Design a binder for this molecule. Structure first.
Ligand SMILES: CC(=O)O[C@H](C)C[N+](C)(C)C
Length: 175
């Protein structure tokens, strides 16, 4: 195993990452970058809702990681966290339990501008993992979504946890 437990390394200056979303309302998510856990139950920084790590796209430094309660939290807290990002900031997102109840149109639009295809349709108890970036042009290649649906839900009441891994190119110091 290589960085973050991937089966292959990420060469050419790329950042290795792995995200696992939550399982129902009992197993928290985790976000790994370059073999370091940005968010996990061991770091004790995850919670129900959206678990978001903001990362410098040049250095890979963690700027901040926070969980946002999407059931009872004020969505303006989430919005203040994700709106004023510098160009190239990477945005790692893992849902836990319910990512959607407090999401509003402004939040869906901002995630879309960060590269999300699934934010526009996110609904109660969906599973979602996503890596976006401030200034991305096309949609992100790192996004998975599972709808909360009784026919397919792994759990009584919730969809399965998602696992996503990959290699992210570094931004240059140019500019
Ligand atoms: C700038 C741009 O392009 O962005 C980056 C590459 C990141 N992701 C995550 C989206 C992949």
């Amino acid at each position: 195993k290589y960085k973050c437990g991937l089966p292959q390394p990420c060469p050419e200056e790329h950042l290795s990452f792995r995200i696992v979303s939550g399982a129902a309302n009992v197993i928290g998510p985790k976000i790994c970058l370059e073999d370091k856990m940005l968010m996990s139950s061991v770091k004790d920084n995850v919670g129900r809702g959206l678990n978001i790590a903001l990362v410098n796209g040049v250095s890979g430094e963690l700027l901040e990681a926070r969980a946002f309660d999407m059931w009872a939290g004020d969505v303006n807290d989430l919005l203040k966290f994700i709106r004023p990002l510098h160009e190239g900031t990477l945005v790692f997102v893992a849902s836990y339990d319910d990512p959607a109840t407090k999401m509003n149109e402004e939040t869906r639009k901002l995630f879309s501008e960060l590269g999300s295809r699934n934010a526009k349709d996110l609904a109660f108890r969906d599973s979602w993992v996503f890596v976006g970036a401030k200034g991305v042009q096309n949609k992100s290649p790192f996004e998975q979504h599972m709808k909360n649906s009784k026919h397919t839900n792994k759990y009584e009441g919730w969809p399965e946890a998602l696992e996503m891994e990959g290699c992210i190119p570094r931004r240059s110091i140019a500019g």
